[PDB]
């Protein structure tokens, strides 16, 4: 019954593509789908990748329109990538419609030795904007399933 649009945010270098490929010969990784069953309820998930480069900054809203959820990926070793998430959240929160369900995803937790964004800053930021924070490692296939499962739960609620 439920059909959900989920936008994916981040530059290529934060490893967003590996993350969604993990979850979902592949021709393209820009539009991706999953059919899910949650509490005997059927869920159609569509993942809409959005161009993360600075030159495309004004285009976000066109992509974000009518989203049900958003997955904002940053690289835990790159504080600039986290700063980008905070600006994206501001945009997502100005979208006309219902509250988009936000995930703030700290990727490459396999490089925790080299992390620049503290767990406390990331989780406290997420709470402040009504988002949820997740740790993932596309490299080691951790946290990916939990993220998408939880988001759908949240989008149903």
């Amino acid at each position: 019954a439920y059909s959900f649009k989920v936008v994916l945010l981040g530059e290529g270098c934060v490893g967003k593509t590996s993350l969604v490929l993990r979850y979902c010969t592949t021709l393209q990784a820009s539009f991706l789908t999953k059919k899910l069953n949650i509490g005997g309820k059927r869920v159609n998930l569509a993942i809409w990748d959005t161009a993360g480069q600075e030159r495309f900054h004004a285009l976000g809203p066109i992509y974000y329109r009518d989203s049900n959820g958003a997955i904002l990926v940053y690289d835990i070793t790159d504080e600039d990538s986290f700063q980008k998430v905070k600006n994206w959240v501001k945009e997502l929160r100005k979208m006309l419609g219902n509250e988009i369900c936000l995930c703030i995803v700290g990727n490459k937790i396999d490089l925790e030795k080299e992390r620049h964004v503290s767990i406390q800053e990331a989780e406290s930021y997420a709470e402040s904007v009504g988002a949820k924070h997740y740790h993932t490692s596309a490299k080691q296939n951790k946290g990916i399933e939990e993220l998408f499962l939880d988001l759908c739960k949240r989008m149903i609620e």
Partner: protein, 253 residues
Amino acid sequence: SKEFIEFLKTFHKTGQEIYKQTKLFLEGMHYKRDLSIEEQSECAQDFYHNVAERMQTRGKVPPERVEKIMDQIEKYIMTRLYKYVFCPETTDDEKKDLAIQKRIRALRWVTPQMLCVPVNEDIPEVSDMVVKAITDIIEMDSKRVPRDKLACITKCSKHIFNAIKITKNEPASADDFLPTLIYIVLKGNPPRLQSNIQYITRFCNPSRLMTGEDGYYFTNLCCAVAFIEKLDAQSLNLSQEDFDRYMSGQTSP
């Protein structure tokens, strides 16, 4: 038109009701022809909304066949409405078409390298994909039904995806895809581009655009056009000196 009737006859005391409601809507549109295109579009969209719901309620039809018949409805109504609601004289659709056409023409000098396009046109198979993608986006204007215009955008995107995958040997992300679609649009300068976009927005069955692949590719086309409209020296990593020289039409990059 004959096919629509024969199609609906299949559905018994649900097909007659849809036909009546479709005829009512179309009669409503005739008496709205002198209203604004916004008002005409709201009418069609309400109609899509209401016919779909009145099928789930007082009809009991499986959601599989529901999409299939909404496609038939859209084709009947839009085939009949096209001459009246595509690029209407009461709108700035023509004005917008000319401005984007002139803008795309002005930017004929922009290279794929400037846009960081991940396609290598020296590979014959890539070159063939690019040729097809340009033809796909050009063909959009030749189709009357929003679903068929969307199919051109979607075909174009998949030919682009092939071009990128052959060049890079990795599946395109949005970061790979969008600059390539921008480049294809710049090369194609597709006829009546804004009129096609406005028509799809105004008259496409609103559902097909919401989550599924046609919606994604259409959204990307919208992003491409918006980028092209505001493109500046900084967009292409150029000095104002070089950008202005290229814009004069007097200098090759």
